[PDB]
Write a protein that binds this ligand. Structure first.
Ligand SMILES: [N]S(=O)(=O)[N][C]C1234B567B89%10B%11%12%13B85%14B%1158B%12%11%15B%139%12B%1061B%12%112C5%153B%14874
Ligand SMILES: [Zn+2]
Length: 258
């Protein structure tokens, strides 16, 4: 509730309040690249973000969410493994205290410095709340971050973080274009899984891009200045807000590329 990323409330404890934490399709997972199989049945992936309308950025005490107006069919994900149309509702990141950790998914056990999640809901279910009662309710586009060159399209996010340092703070964040966070290639891996935060609901088709984006050390250092705590409370830096890899169980990871 109550849940977080610490010793007494972190991922090892979540199962007590959220028993699905030990479920059959939990996320993240390690992506074993040798075992993932090219799937010719996957259709072309379509990321259509031209009309995306951002509203606000919020520090929710675990991460920050950039929120979108999803009241009309605008920013949508379709194709690939997906049947129908999934509407963008928000994005957020997971990141580490050091550049050698921070991602939730891993690639041949490699951890990236951070991971971006663009969260979408299946428009056949009418609203996000109904979508998370369905096994195909959500699609999350996951993008790895490595530290090197700056990502210019990220800088507007970085520069607003000073205004949402603590839990419960929000700021207007209109006219942000999420196209500036996408790598060149849409090559991906896909598998059925879950939300990686409580309530850990098993509603997600994961689409994890193979090509990371590069961000600068200065950009990620600013993520690490955020706080888990609220205003006036003792400072706990918002770092290491990632769940580690979970058992693959009865799943196969499919690749979009040969
Ligand atoms: N890492 S994740 O995208 O699986 N889960 C993060 C969340 B935050 B809150 B709503 B929002 B949407 B749902 B709950 B929490 B869960 C998705 B966003
Ligand atoms: Zn996430």
């Amino acid at each position: 509730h109550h849940w977080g990323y610490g010793k007494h409330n972190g991922p090892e404890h979540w199962h007590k309040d959220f028993p699905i934490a030990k479920g059959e399709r939990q996320s993240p997972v390690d992506i074993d690249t040798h075992t993932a199989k090219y799937d010719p049945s996957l259709k072309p992936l379509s990321v259509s973000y031209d009309q995306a309308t951002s509203l606000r950025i919020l520090n929710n005490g675990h991460a920050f969410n950039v929120e979108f107006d999803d009241s009309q069919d605008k920013a949508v994900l379709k194709g690939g493994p997906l049947d129908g149309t999934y509407r963008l509702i928000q994005f957020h990141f997971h990141w580490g205290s050091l550049d050698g950790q921070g991602s939730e998914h891993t690639v041949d056990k490699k951890k990236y410095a951070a991971e971006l999640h663009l969260v979408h809901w299946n428009t056949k279910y009418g609203d996000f709340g109904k979508a998370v009662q369905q096994p195909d309710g959500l699609a999350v586009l996951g993008i790895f971050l490595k530290v090197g060159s700056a990502k210019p399209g990220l800088q507007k996010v970085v520069d607003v973080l000073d205004s949402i340092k603590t839990k419960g703070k929000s700021a207007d964040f209109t006219n942000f274009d999420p196209r500036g966070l996408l790598p060149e290639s849409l090559d991906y891996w896909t598998y059925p899984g879950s939300l990686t935060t409580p309530p850990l609901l098993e509603c997600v088709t994961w689409i994890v891009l193979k090509e990371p984006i590069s961000v600068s050390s200065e950009q990620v250092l600013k993520f690490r200045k955020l706080n888990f705590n609220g205003e006036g409370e003792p400072e706990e830096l918002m770092v290491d807000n990632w769940r580690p890899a979970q058992p693959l169980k009865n799943r196969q990871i499919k690749a979009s590329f040969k």
